[PDB]
Design a protein around this ligand. Structure first.
Ligand SMILES: [Cl-]
Ligand SMILES: [Cl-]
Ligand SMILES: [Cl-]
Lengths: 117, 117
């Protein structure tokens, strides 16, 4: 049986906007709106135009606190268009968080979990 | 030419825990823990052991506010085990909300879109 955890186990969240060559322009446009809308509320990573790390799509990262989660995730849910977004909590166990605690705005993708740990 | 929306557009959130014959006990355990952890203050629908509405799997519904979103969604992310969970905001447009504002804890599923008419 699984042991239940409290939300205090979550130190922070990462979201990754996924895209590819076909959706690059749309991804860029959303990234500019995130900059415009969320300056100081999250850390925005580089625009990766290849698969990096465990990500099977081109991507960029947003890193944010539990206190920003509802506002930012709600806004992304409303405004993501056709871009899939991968989200996961950071609990101190990268493989477990990616393998077992993946959240998707839009469609899910099979991660490159073998890249972890 | 998307019009960006504010989270004020969201009246409420709805989650649907998906399960099947293979995963009934886990789905039930989760439901009971939801009931206990929020002391019956969330809105819980019927435990459906058949596909209902737009849901291709057996399911049960949870409804909650934007102000409950971070805690509940965090908790579900940590505690869902292998159960996929469909979430969507309610903006008054059931088609658009289900089609375009779907969020999935775990893996995404194709909805039975016919049921949205
Ligand atoms: Cl670099
Ligand atoms: Cl959208
Ligand atoms: Cl979506």
């Amino acid at each position: 049986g699984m042991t239940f955890r409290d939300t205090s186990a979550i130190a922070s969240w990462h979201a990754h906007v996924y895209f590819d060559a076909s959706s690059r322009d749309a991804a860029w446009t959303l990234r500019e709106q995130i900059e415009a809308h969320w300056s100081g509320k999250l850390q925005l990573g580089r625009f990766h135009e290849r698969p990096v790390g465990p990500h099977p799509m081109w991507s960029y990262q947003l890193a944010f606190t539990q206190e920003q989660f509802a506002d930012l995730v709600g806004w992304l849910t409303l405004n993501h268009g056709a871009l899939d977004i991968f989200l996961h909590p950071n609990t101190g166990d990268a493989l477990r968080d990616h393998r077992d605690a993946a959240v998707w705005i839009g469609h899910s993708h099979e991660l490159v979990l073998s890249a972890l740990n």
